[PDB]
Amino acid sequence: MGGNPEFVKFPEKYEQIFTHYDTANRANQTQLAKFYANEIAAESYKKGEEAAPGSIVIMEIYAPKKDAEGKIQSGEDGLFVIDKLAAIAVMEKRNDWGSAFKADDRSGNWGFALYDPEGKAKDNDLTCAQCHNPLQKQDNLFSFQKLVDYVKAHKL
Ligand code: HEC
C-alpha cells in the first residue's frame, strides 16, 4: 500500500472545515482535483513558503464523466465534469513523527496517505514521496503557488 495510513489518519469532516483553495484538472488529464488546506497550513503559507507542523493539505480526486466510448466530458470552463469522488489524498506535516514512520516514506517531514471516499485506506502501489521529493524548493507541494496565491488574496 502506497502511503502510510498507520500514521497519517483520515481527517474527518475536512470538506466542511478546511479551506478549499483550488479546483483544477489533474496533470494526468484524466481526473479532476479539488485542493484543501487546514488552518495551520493556510497560516503557514500566509507567513512564508514552508508549512508549519500540524499542516494538512488534501486533494480530492474525482473521476470525470465519460461517454460510452471513453471520451471525457468537459465544461466550457475547460474543467472536467465530475462523475464521482474517487479518492482523498492526504499530506500531513509533523516535526516529530515517530521512529516507526520510516523517513524514506516521507517527503521531508510530510507524511502521505490515500483514502477512498468512505475514509478507508485505498489500495494503491504509488510511491508518494518519490514523486513529491524533487519539489523540495516549493515544500514538496505541486499546488504550492495556487495555495500561496489563495491565502494572500483572502482573509483568515
Ligand atoms: C507522481 C507520479 C505522483 C505520485 C507517486 C503521487 N502524487 Fe501527489 N500529486 C502529484 C501531482 C502532479 C499533484 C498536483 C495535482 C495534479 O495531479 O496535477 C499532486 C498533488 C497531491 C496533493 C495535493 C498537494 C500538492 O502537492 O499539490 C496531495 C495531498 C497528494 N498529491 C498526495 C499524494 C499521495 C497520498 C500519494 C501516494 C498514495 C501521492 N500523492 C503520490 C503527483 C504524484
Side-chain angles (χ1 to χ4, degrees), residues 1-14 16-42 44-45 47-68 70 72-101 103-151 153-154:
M1 152 103 51
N4 299 80
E6 169 73 358
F7 298 108
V8 176
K9 307 309 209 313
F10 184 67
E12 284 292 340
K13 289 202 272 277
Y14 69 90
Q16 300 176 274
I17 294 174
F18 286 29
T19 295
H20 172 214
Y21 66 92
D22 193 39
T23 297
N25 295 338
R26 298 198 64 195
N28 59 28
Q29 302 302 330
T30 62
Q31 296 170 317
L32 182 295
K34 300 187 172 176
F35 302 81
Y36 302 80
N38 76 349
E39 186 188 335
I40 295 168
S44 293
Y45 291 109
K47 297 167 184 292
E49 305 185 324
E50 293 165 16
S55 298
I56 299 168
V57 172
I58 291 167
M59 175 177 64
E60 291 177 338
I61 302 173
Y62 290 88
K65 282 191 193 183
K66 311 167 86 172
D67 64 21
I72 295 175
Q73 184 185 338
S74 179
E76 298 185 356
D77 64 2
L79 295 173
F80 300 148
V81 178
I82 288 174
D83 174 7
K84 63 194 207 174
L85 183 63
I88 301 160
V90 184
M91 286 173 72
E92 178 179 347
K93 190 176 282 192
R94 299 195 193 181
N95 67 348
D96 56 8
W97 285 117
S99 44
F101 195 176
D104 198 52
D105 286 350
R106 293 199 294 280
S107 288
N109 276 342
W110 286 110
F112 296 89
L114 186 68
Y115 289 96
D116 70 15
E118 292 73 45
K120 302 180 165 173
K122 187 183 196 296
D123 293 342
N124 75 92
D125 303 311
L126 297 178
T127 53
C128 319
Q130 284 63 46
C131 186
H132 284 253
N133 274 342
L135 275 58
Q136 323 100 313
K137 188 170 184 70
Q138 54 189 66
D139 200 25
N140 305 107
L141 291 188
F142 286 85
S143 58
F144 176 87
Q145 198 45 49
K146 290 291 186 179
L147 180 47
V148 167
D149 285 348
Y150 187 92
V151 302
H154 297 83

